[PDB]
Paper text:
Despite nearly 3 billion years of evolution, all oxygenic photosynthetic organisms use the same large pigment–protein complexes, known as photosystem I (PSI) and photosystem II (PSII), to convert solar energy to chemical energy. Both complexes use light to induce a charge separation event, then transport the high-energy electron, ultimately to be stored as a chemical bond. The first high-resolution structure of cyanobacterial PSI revealed a core antenna system comprised of 96 chlorophyll a (Chla) molecules, of which 6 are integral to the electron transport chain (ETC), while the remaining chlorophyll molecules function to harvest light and transfer excitation energy to the ETC. The PsaL subunit has been shown to be vital for these larger oligomeric complexes to form.
Author numbering:
A (entry chain F): 1 to 141
B (entry chain J): 2 to 40
C (entry chain I): 1 to 38
D (entry chain A): 11 to 751
E (entry chain E): 2 to 69
F (entry chain L): 4 to 163
G (entry chain C): 2 to 81
H (entry chain D): 3 to 141
Write the structure that this text describes.
């Protein structure tokens, strides 16, 4: 239940720090906005917010939402890269547009890269995502 | 015509991509600063 | 400086023997061993 | 003999080659089959000799690339003047230069970097700059930011003009090969026309602009009631009310009555007590004297009219018994090889930049330069680093000359042939003097560590202990302190307060003190000589053994830049001339780091500090160079541990970017050792393991991933090593001196 | 079945393109040990350090191959 | 006029410079105890050891842990004796391994044939021992008997 | 002395012999190649081990292969 | 045998013969030229190929073939007629580089198979087979 971690509003070390939060942007009340926004976290004896990473809810915003957001964005980047790499193979001049990127193909790969997990599941169930161990270069033992 | 091929090279496009990504992150942390976690 | 332990004169003999005398002997003997022909 | 002949439109201006990388090399044009193509694209982009075999095309490329480099430098200079004009407190600094720090860069508040805007005075928040631009503009007579804005606009116009000239001299009217071979005209126009006319124009500016504006500034007039420099020329009455020898015209110049110009052309010598800089009358007189001397020297060489020298009969006549044939072949060497010219020019520019560093600290040329310790420390450190880099590049290009441009047919029994013939006697005696200097410069420190550790303070090499007083340098200091009035009878004071005299102090801080030399100075100067000698040993060993050795006799066919000849002959690793530059970069790092450490400790302990009202000087550290700069533990404790208390406690303050850069340089130094220690065959096998995992998911790249080559691995390691160490020392120096200075 | 232009997979373990598919440039009919010249899309490691080029063909035997 | 010539054979890796082999360095190197024509071993070694033992009572007598103490000259003598003994052990084991004929250079066209054998290098080592002990003791006696001898005050005021 | 071994996957391109700096290698006639020749290493006691022959070999894995073994005064390449 | 040759006009260097050349072995290269030109020694510096036949001594075989490569390539008269010998201090001379009289890159009858394996390099025995014996897996 994390009795050692108190909420930052009830913690009497966070309230001493929260007066002297510096402004980060040009907004004059940015320190006060940070102070009110970090009060819902858990603070230790230092008076600083802590993040609990075990997938629980009311602390899913620490890791689960940023983690799923990164997984979507990184899957977007990797899937668009893999799609471009596959698309530039079977047209007999691949190093030149590996080094000088074909922009009209890359734009069509990028803007249609939002549906990366559906295409990933389709290629996984279709077997066209993973190359079989026979048709692949392997170093000598 | 030969200029668009130079702009389609890997360093020019990676520089444009990194400047666009850094600008997007900087413009996000200006308007919405101090996001340690999702509330 | 001699110590309060028993036989305090033995550091005054063994330490120069193990630090100067027998390393000179071992390097001379090993030099003759590793540099002799046949 | 010297005429202008060009080819009209030799290279068309088209963008078709912009989209075809690797066009300059035949091997780079087949296409990127491996990732080594990408690194070879940048490694051989400027090597114009490997691109074309015709020296005329190489010289044309070099001449047109110089204009692009000058355009880049002019963009940089215009950016600095624009930052002074728009984002600086220069107008605030001119009012109160003793309590307002120079700042010329504000930091945008998007994250918590708004703390990096230091409170420097006058209601201005920004980064305290240490470049010395503010003192330079005060010595230039610049009073308002509009004069900086005009100079920034002029810098942009000049940068565009240099870009247009670079396009013009490669695509519209490109000079022939014999336009470059007549170095007689080139050197005459660089001595008289560039250095001579440039210093004459600056002497005229310092007569007409810098001297009246700076005399009104030192007299106590605020800069916004100080008249602009053009009514000093338009109205000579205001110019002649101060320094009243402008009442008479230019006729005493032409009747050789130069003595009446003595009020504004002085030879005072010392420092200005008001500002702490050199007298601007001394600088104007100096620029006039060297302008006349350079213009005279620019009439030495025969160009078109019979009078003059040809720089060959000078070389032909210089021959002795120990050499025989002499300098025959050297004119053809320096007029057919660009690399020999770069090796000479880069060595002299590096030693020149080191001279600039060693001179501007002792004779500060600018008002309130010695008062701001951060500016003085930064310009000394920066010019030492630039100078040492240029010297190592000179060793590099001498090595490139020896395998790519040296011809044994033109060099029989001359100086270069005989240097190659007794290179073993050169390198072995240099090796001996390096070993001797290492023992009798570093073993003194080791002995001092041992006797200070063993409780033997009387057995050390100290001032209280066995003394090692530098009697020759002290004798030379005594000669310079007594030089004014005895051997320089028309100097008011010495050239610098370093050699003797009194404490020159401005405000409450010391401008300069006498710098007494003791046992610690002797020992650290011998370490300086030792490290310089080892850098000379590695670079000169790379030069002399560039073509051949007892190990690899056919080493010129392998080239300048090759990794090794193989594991044979015991293993011929790092045999090339490039790898000696690679090791000499580490040794210039070591040398110049010890130089700037000696500077940053000696000046902080014995020169810099505050002046008590009683008259004594309380220094920054407290004069601990006499007793702690004789031990490595003293250098670790009283210099590295003690003075880095500012860079590590800088977090949450205005100098926290320096602590960040301190840690960042530590990271890059540690990151270098992955490339320096490991080898290519580990990483190629690791990339082979990664390629299969990419092949498993159809992620095979068309350009096959290779590990970095052995020379590129060494280059990446040494570049990261130098970057991480230099950034660390920059951060440590600047955060220390922005807290104690 | 080994003829010029047929795509074929390498069975030499030590080859760079072990279990990789390349085309046949020529097959020699004389009595030599490795008559099948096979050219590949990728390039070998071969070359000096820093060399951007490498070989992409080699001779192979009949038993060192399989037709796809 | 080439003052820097070869030794008569250009393809040998050496040069006959003024310092190397001109007129005054061929003599005085051929006339040192090593390379002198008429001397036997245990006489070359005697002369070399006497010179070495005499010179080595300079950085032990006034440069040591006891140099501020009246036992300082005696400790310097003992240290010189110990260094001469270590060097004699080094010479003895160098000979006992087996020596070749010494290197002939431009300065020394004739090297001592008597030092090309193990028996000659044993005589050289014994002569070095006796010479080193004699030279160290002679320098000790000369430095000790006036008990101040203000030439020792020079280079000890320097090595304070 | 090093062991320079030439294997039967040799195309007889003679690049190893021209790349060899100490005349270790030569060409002998051979019926098992299209070029009609194979490399041989008779005076392999002169091999320093530089592997310039292994650098110049155009086979997928090298038909000429240097094994660094016992070190002599010629394998070290010592002028002294 | 006995090496009839005159030495090129060289000023003498420090990279030449050391003490082991007169005690262990030294090497020689003799070559005939019909013109006088300038060459670079592996010793260091430049020397003069005088008219006629030349004899040079070196401390290594690699220095002699580094000279022979400079005699073959990079010269317009294209000198191939060079012979390399080994001289032991006993006096014996062994004729080394053009043993058949033809260069090794050109095939010649009368040369036998040295170091030739009638097996693929991948078809080599494992070291675990050859444990505790003098035989190494490349035999
Ligand atoms: C299409 C691009 C792509 C894809 C999807 C993959 C995917 C893979 N890589 Mg990666 N990688 C790539 C490019 C790519 N990589 C490049 C450019 C580099 C060189 C820096 C590497 C070097 C590399 C290493 C060293 C390792 C991986 C690993 C892996 C695996 C785990 C993911 C990971 O660790 O990411 C790590 C990703 C990086 C370190 C760099 C990725 C760079 C960007 C994000 C790639 C996408 C941008 C691309 C340049 C342009 C897209 C094309 C566009 C024009 C449409 C996974 C199979 C690991 C593995 O084997 O796990 C099984 C492994 O150890 N990769
Ligand atoms: C690699 C590890 C890593 C991790 C986990 C983080 C994570 C974070 N950093 Mg960061 N940081 C790192 C390394 C890292 N950083 C390094 C290397 C530096 C030094 C250069 C910094 C310096 C730094 C500072 C100075 C700041 C952060 C902040 C942030 C926070 C939010 C940033 C943001 O804009 O989110 C919001 C972004 C989004 C919501 C994404 C929206 C746009 C996406 C791309 C598109 C989505 C489409 C669907 C977050 C906690 C900021 C913060 O709030 O501090 C707590 C902050 O001010 N970081
Ligand atoms: C990486 C290159 C680099 C960088 C970024 C800088 C940057 C800096 N330099 Mg520097 N410099 C360098 C290399 C570098 N320099 C080299 C290679 C030299 C040797 C020529 C110098 C010599 C130099 C001097 C002498 C001074 C600077 C100063 C400056 C500072 C202000 C710049 C300015 O406007 O000064 C403007 C300064 C001047 C115009 C005076 C320079 C006039 C010199 C004496 C004439 C040189 C003529 C010619 C170009 C060289 C010919 C060489 C000859 C042997 C043939 C700044 C920190 C100044 C400084 O520290 O002020 C606080 C300063 O006075 N530098
Ligand atoms: C008085 C005559 C004169 C002047 C002003 C100069 C000045 C210069 N020359 Mg030039 N040159 C001249 C005549 C002249 N040259 C003659 C007659 C020859 C032909 C034999 C050469 C051939 C020559 C070569 C081939 C090179 C130079 C270069 C340089 C530049 C040195 C870089 C520097 O420190 O710039 C600082 C000084 C300034 C920016 C002041 C500019 C003054 C303007 C031009 C008036 C500088 C612009 C080098 C260079 O950088 O090329 C661009 C170079 O590559 N010149
Ligand atoms: C290249 C540099 C240069 C340039 C262009 C100038 C420019 C000029 N000088 Mg000069 N001056 C210079 C070098 C220079 N000087 C130096 C080096 C000296 C020292 C010998 C002087 C000493 C000087 C005096 C004594 C006077 C001039 C004056 C003049 C002006 C001529 C008369 C006139 O226009 O009214 C003119 C502004 C006269 C003037 O009008 O001053 C405002 C004046 O009386 N000059
Ligand atoms: C101690 C060294 C030394 C000696 C013995 C010589 C000897 C020679 N120099 Mg001199 N000279 C030297 C150093 C020396 N120089 C230095 C350091 C410089 C560069 C600053 C010069 C610059 C120089 C030039 C420009 C010329 C000579 C020439 C001469 C010759 C005639 C003597 C004469 O009038 O000038 C004596 C000068 C000095 C002693 C100074 C003679 C061969 C001339 C020549 O080429 O003759 C064939 C000539 O044109 N010298
Ligand atoms: C007047 C100055 C001068 C000039 C123009 C030359 C000219 C040249 N040099 Mg160089 N050289 C010099 C100074 C000079 N150099 C100095 C100062 C060094 C000492 C370090 C050397 C050492 C040297 C060697 C060792 C070699 C050359 C070679 C080259 C040639 C091609 C360069 C190329 O294409 O590489 C372009 C490569 C780069 C631009 C990469 C540089 C990467 C650096 C480390 C980064 C810059 C530092 C920066 C502040 C880091 C910021 C990090 C941040 C972005 C994150 C060309 C003849 C090469 C050659 O001729 O090959 C046969 C060669 O191998 N140079
Ligand atoms: C602390 C680190 C360190 C040390 C000890 C050395 C040591 C050496 N370097 Mg250096 N170097 C280093 C790091 C180091 N380097 C690294 C990082 C690189 C960069 C890549 C190299 C690469 C390098 C090159 C490229 C060269 C050297 C050379 C030298 C030698 C200079 C001659 C000298 O000073 O002799 C005196 C020795 C010392 C000062 C070391 C301290 C020894 C003390 C004073 C004496 C103590 C001995 C002790 C009493 C013995 C009795 C103990 C008993 C139990 C055995 C010396 C052996 C140069 C060389 O060999 O030519 C001369 C040279 O060419 N260095
Ligand atoms: C560390 C260096 C060192 C030190 C401090 C001394 C110090 C000593 N030597 Mg010595 N010496 C040295 C090196 C050293 N030596 C070397 C390198 C040589 C060979 C050139 C000599 C050759 C030498 C001779 C020939 C004599 C001295 C003598 C002296 C003594 C008086 C010096 C004198 O007359 O000054 C004034 C003093 C004990 C004298 C001596 O030992 O008499 C007792 C004497 O006759 N020394
Ligand atoms: C100033 C440098 C001192 C140079 C020694 C002068 C002596 C000198 O100049 O000799 C004079 C001699 C000049 O010979 P020639 O009369 O043939 O010279 C004609 C010249 O005009 C060149 O053609 O030079 C040589 O023979 C080079 C030998 C140097 C060998 C000595 C090594 C010097 C390096 C070590 C000494 C360093 C001391 C450095 C102190 C800073």
């Amino acid at each position: 239940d994390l009795s050692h971690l108190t909420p930052c509003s009830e913690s009497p070390a966070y309230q001493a720090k929260a007066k002297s939060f510096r402004n980060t942007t040009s907004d004059p009340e940015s320190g006060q906005k940070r102070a009110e926004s970090y009060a819902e976290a858990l603070c230790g004896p230092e008076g600083y917010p802590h993040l609990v990473v075990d997938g629980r809810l009311d602390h899913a915003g620490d890791f689960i939402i940023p983690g799923l957001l990164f997984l979507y964005v990184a899957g977007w980047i990797g899937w668009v890269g893999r799609s471009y790499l596959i698309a530039i193979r079977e047209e007999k001049d691949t190093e030149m547009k590996e080094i000088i990127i074909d922009v009209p193909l890359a734009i069509n790969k990028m803007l249609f890269g939002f549906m990366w997990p559906l295409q990933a599941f389709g290629e996984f169930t279709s077997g066209k995502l993973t190359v079989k161990d026979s048709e692949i270069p392997v170093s000598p033992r | 015509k030969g200029l668009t091929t130079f702009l389609s090279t890997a360093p020019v496009l990676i520089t444009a991509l990194l400047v666009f990504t850094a600008g997007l992150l900087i413009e996000f942390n200006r308007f919405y600063p101090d996001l340690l976690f999702h509330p | 400086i001699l110590g309060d332990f028993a036989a305090s004169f033995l550091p005054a003999i063994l330490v120069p023997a193990v630090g100067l005398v027998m390393p000179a002997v071992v390097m001379g003997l090993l030099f003759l061993q590793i540099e002799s022909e046949a | 003999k010297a005429k202008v002949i060009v080819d009209k439109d030799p290279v068309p201006t088209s963008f078709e080659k912009w989209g075809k990388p690797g066009h300059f090399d035949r091997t780079l044009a087949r296409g990127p089959k491996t990732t080594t193509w990408i690194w070879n694209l940048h490694a051989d982009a400027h090597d114009f000799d490997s691109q074309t075999s015709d020296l005329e095309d190489i010289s044309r490329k070099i001449f047109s690339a110089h204009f692009g480099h000058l355009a880049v430098v002019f963009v940089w200079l215009s950016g600095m003047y624009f930052h002074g004009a728009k984002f600086s407190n220069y107008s605030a600094w001119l009012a109160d230069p003793l309590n307002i720090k120079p700042s010329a860069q504000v930091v945008w508040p998007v994250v918590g970097q708004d703390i990096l805007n230091a409170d420097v005075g006058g209601g201005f928040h920004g980064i305290q700059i240490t470049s010395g631009f503010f003192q330079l503009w005060r010595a230039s007579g610049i009073t308002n930011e509009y004069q900086l804005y005009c100079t920034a606009i002029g810098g942009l116009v000049m940068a565009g003009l240099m870009l247009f000239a670079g396009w013009f001299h490669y695509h519209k009217a490109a000079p022939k090969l014999e336009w470059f071979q007549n170095v007689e005209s080139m050197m005459n126009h660089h001595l008289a026309g560039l250095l001579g006319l440039g210093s004459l124009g600056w002497a005229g500016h310092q007569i007409h602009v810098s001297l009246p504006i700076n005399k009104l500034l030192d007299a106590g007039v605020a800069p916004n009631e100080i008249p602009l420099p053009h009514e000093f020329i338009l109205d000579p009455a205001k110019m002649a009310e101060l320094y009243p020898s402008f009442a008479q015209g230019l006729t005493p110049f032409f009747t050789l009555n130069w003595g009446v110009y003595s009020d504004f052309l002085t030879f005072k010598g010392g420092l200005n007590p008001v500002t702490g800089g050199l007298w601007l009358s001394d600088t104007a007189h100096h620029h006039l004297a060297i302008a006349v001397l350079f213009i005279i020297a620019g009439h030495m060489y025969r160009t078109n009219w019979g009078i003059g020298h040809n720089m060959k009969e000078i070389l032909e006549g210089h021959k002795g018994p120990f050499t025989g044939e002499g300098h025959k072949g050297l004119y053809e060497i320096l007029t057919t090889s660009w690399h020999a010219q770069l090796a000479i020019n880069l060595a002299l520019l590096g030693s020149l930049t080191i001279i600039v560093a060693q001179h501007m600290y002792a004779m500060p040329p600018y008002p309130y330069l010695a008062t701001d310790y951060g500016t003085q420390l930064s310009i000394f450190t920066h010019h030492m680093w630039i100078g040492g880099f240029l010297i190592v590049g000179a060793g590099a290009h001498a090595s490139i000359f020896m395998v790519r441009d040296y011809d044994p047919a033109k060099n029989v029994n001359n100086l270069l042939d005989r240097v190659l013939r007794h290179r073993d006697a050169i390198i072995s005696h240099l090796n001996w003097v390096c070993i001797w200097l290492g023992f009798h410069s570093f073993g003194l420190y080791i002995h001092n560590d041992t006797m200070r550790a063993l409780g033997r303070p009387q057995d050390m090499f100290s001032d209280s202990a066995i003394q090692l007083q530098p009697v020759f340098a002290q004798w030379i200091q005594g000669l310079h302190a007594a030089a004014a009035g005895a051997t320089a009878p028309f100097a008011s004071a010495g050239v610098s307060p370093v050699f003797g005299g009194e404490v020159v102090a401005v405000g409450g801080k010391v401008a300069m003190m006498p710098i007494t030399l003791g046992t610690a100075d002797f020992m650290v100067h011998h370490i300086h000589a030792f490290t310089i000698h080892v850098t000379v040993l590695i670079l000169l060993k790379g030069v002399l053994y560039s073509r051949s050795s007892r190990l690899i006799p056919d080493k010129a066919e392998l080239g300048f830049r090759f990794p090794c000849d193989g594991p044979g002959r015991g293993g011929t690793c790092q045999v090339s001339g490039w790898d000696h530059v690679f090791l000499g970069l580490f040794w210039m790092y070591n040398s110049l780091s010890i130089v700037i450490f000696h500077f940053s400790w000696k000046m902080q302990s014995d020169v810099w500090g505050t002046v008590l009202p009683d008259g004594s000087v309380s220094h920054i550290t407290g004069g601990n160079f006499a007793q702690s700069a004789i031990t490595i533990n003293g250098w670790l404790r009283d210099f590295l541990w003690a003075q880095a208390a500012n860079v590590i406690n800088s977090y949450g303050s205005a100098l926290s970017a320096y602590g960040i850069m301190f840690l960042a340089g530590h990271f890059v130094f540690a990151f270098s050792l992955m490339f320096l220690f490991s080898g290519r065959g580990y990483w190629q096998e690791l990339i082979e393991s990664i390629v299969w995992a990419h092949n498993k998911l159809k992620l095979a790249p068309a350009i096959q991933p290779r590990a970095l080559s052995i020379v590129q691995g060494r280059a990446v390691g040494v570049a990261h090593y130098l970057l991480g160490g230099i950034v660390t020392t920059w951060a440590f120096f600047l955060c220390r001196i922005l807290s104690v200075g | 079945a080994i003829q010029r232009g047929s795509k074929v997979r390498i069975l030499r373990k030590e080859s760079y393109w072990y279990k990789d598919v390349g085309t046949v440039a020529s097959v020699d009919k004389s009595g030599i040990l490795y008559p099948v010249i096979v050219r590949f899309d990728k390039v070998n490691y071969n070359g000096f350090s820093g060399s951007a080029t490498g070989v992409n063909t080699n001779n192979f035997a009949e038993h060192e191959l399989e037709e796809v | 006029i080439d003052v820097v010539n070869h030794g008569g054979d250009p393809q040998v890796g050496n040069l006959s410079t003024p310092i190397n082999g001109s007129a005054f360095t061929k003599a005085f190197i051929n006339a040192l105890p090593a390379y002198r024509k008429g001397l036997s071993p245990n006489r070359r070694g005697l002369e070399v050891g006497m010179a070495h033992g005499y010179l080595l009572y300079g950085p032990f007598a006034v440069l040591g842990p006891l140099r501020l103490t009246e036992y300082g000259p005696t400790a310097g003598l003992l240290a010189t004796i110990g260094l001469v003994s270590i060097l004699t052990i080094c010479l003895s084991i160098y000979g006992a391994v087996g020596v070749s004929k010494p290197t002939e250079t431009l300065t020394t066209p004739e090297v001592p044939m008597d030092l090309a054998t193990k028996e000659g290098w044993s005589e050289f080592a014994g002569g070095f021992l006796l010479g080193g002990c004699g030279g160290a003791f002679f320098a000790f006696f000369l430095c000790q008997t006036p008990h101040l001898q203000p030439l020792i005050e020079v280079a000890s005021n320097i090595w304070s | 002395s090093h062991s320079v071994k030439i294997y039967d996957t040799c195309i007889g391109c003679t690049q190893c012999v021209r790349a060899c700096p100490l005349d270790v290698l030569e060409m002998v006639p051979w019926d098992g190649c299209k070029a009609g020749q194979i490399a041989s290493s008779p005076r392999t006691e002169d091999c320093v081990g530089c592997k310039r022959c292994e650098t110049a070999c155009p086979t997928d894995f090298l038909s000429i292969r240097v094994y660094l073994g016992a070190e002599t005064t010629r394998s070290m390449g010592l002028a002294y | 045998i006995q090496l009839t040759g005159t030495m090129p006009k060289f000023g003498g260097s420090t990279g030449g013969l050391l003490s082991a050349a007169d005690r262990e072995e030294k090497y020689a290269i003799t070559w005939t030229s019909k013109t006088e030109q300038v060459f670079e020694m592996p010793t260091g510096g430049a020397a003069i190929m005088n008219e006629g036949e030349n004899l040079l001594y070196f401390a290594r075989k690699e220095q002699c073939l580094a000279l022979g490569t400079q005699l073959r390539t990079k010269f317009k008269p294209k000198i191939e007629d060079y012979k390399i010998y080994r001289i032991y201090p006993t006096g014996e001379t062994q004729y080394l580089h053009p043993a058949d009289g033809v260069f090794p890159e050109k095939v010649n009858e009368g040369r036998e198979f040295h170091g030739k394996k009638d097996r693929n390099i991948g078809k080599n025995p494992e070291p675990v087979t050859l444990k505790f014996s003098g035989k190494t897996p490349y035999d």
